[PDB]
């Protein structure tokens, strides 16, 4: 069973979906710890009501990214973590950390990368006026632009949509592909080749 750590910053709907899929009969992974850089967020309650230990590592208490990421890394090693899932984690990881976890850290983004990178993808989409958006799960890479893509699901944008409605429709897709992507990676079906490009059995 592959040990997983889910990093969060807020609500935790994606965390929840991963908990459910990991609690499924044939899952190849189990969530052994949940880390939040913000205290008092709902995702923390979801991990707790699930019997999953948590830690709040507040980035505001550190001097730089390196220091903050080192604290996080101490916990992951402490839990013999294999795979790291960034689920709503709103922090940019330091290069050495991303380097360390290359091929073992997945992130979920609410757009069809390379479109609408950064925060507020939904708002960007609606400002732009696309009729198709979606979500993407990928490996975290040195630069947030070369992250190897694992799975994506296109989601339609309705003409009436507000950030709330679109956002909700996109999360439904996210809960589908993050669990599947985790499974894909946890089971070894998907890996990062030596050339750094995605690889399937």
Q: Which residues bind ligand GAR (CB under 6 A)?
A: 8, 10-15, 43, 87-88, 90, 108-110, 119, 121, 135, 171, 174
Q: Which of 62, 111, 127, 116 is nearest to 91 (CA)?
A: 62
- Least CB distance to ligand GAR at residue 16 (A): 8
Q: Which one, 59 or 191, has the nearer CB to ligand GAR?
A: 59
Q: Does the annotation flag 145 for ligand binding?
A: yes
Q: Which one, 10 or 179, has the nearer CB to ligand GAR?
A: 10
Alpha-carbon gap, residue 88 to 119, rounded angstroms = 10
- Least CB distance to ligand GAR at residue 118 (A): 8
| Catalytic residue selected from 59, 109, 138, 175 | 109
Sign of CA dihedral 40, 46, 47, 51: positive
Residue 55 tokens read as 């830690």
Q: Give residues after which the chain gaps, C-N over 2.5 angstroms.
A: none
Does the annotation count 122 as an active-site position? no
Beta strands in 75-171 (DSSP E): 83-86, 105-109, 132-139, 149-156
Q: Does the annotation flag 174 for ligand binding?
A: yes
Q: Does the annotation flag 46 for ligand binding?
A: no
**Catalytic residue numbers, as ranges:** 109
- Residue stretches of the annotated binding site: 12-14, 65, 90-93, 107, 141-145, 171-174
């Amino acid at each position: 069973r592959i040990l997983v750590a889910v990093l969060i910053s807020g609500t935790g709907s994606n965390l929840q979906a991963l908990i459910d899929s990991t609690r499924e009969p044939n899952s190849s992974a189990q969530i052994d710890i949940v880390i939040s850089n913000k205290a008092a967020v709902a995702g923390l309650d979801k991990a707790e009501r699930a019997g999953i230990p948590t830690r709040v590592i507040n980035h505001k208490l550190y001097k730089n990214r390196v220091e903050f990421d080192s604290a996080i890394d101490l916990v992951l090693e402490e839990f013999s973590i294999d795979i790291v899932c960034l689920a709503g984690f709103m922090r940019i990881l330091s290069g050495p950390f991303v380097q360390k976890w290359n091929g073992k850290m997945l992130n979920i983004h609410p757009s069809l990368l390379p479109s609408f990178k950064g925060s507020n993808a939904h708002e960007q989409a609606l400002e732009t006026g696309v009729t198709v958006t979606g979500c993407t799960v990928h490996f975290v890479a040195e630069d947030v632009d070369a992250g190897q893509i694992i799975l994506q699901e296109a989601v339609p944008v309705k003409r009436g949509d507000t950030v709330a409605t679109l956002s909700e429709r996109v999360k439904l897709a996210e809960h589908k592909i993050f669990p599947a992507a985790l499974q894909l990676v946890a089971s070894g079906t998907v890996q990062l080749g030596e050339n750094g490009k995605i690889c399937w059995v």
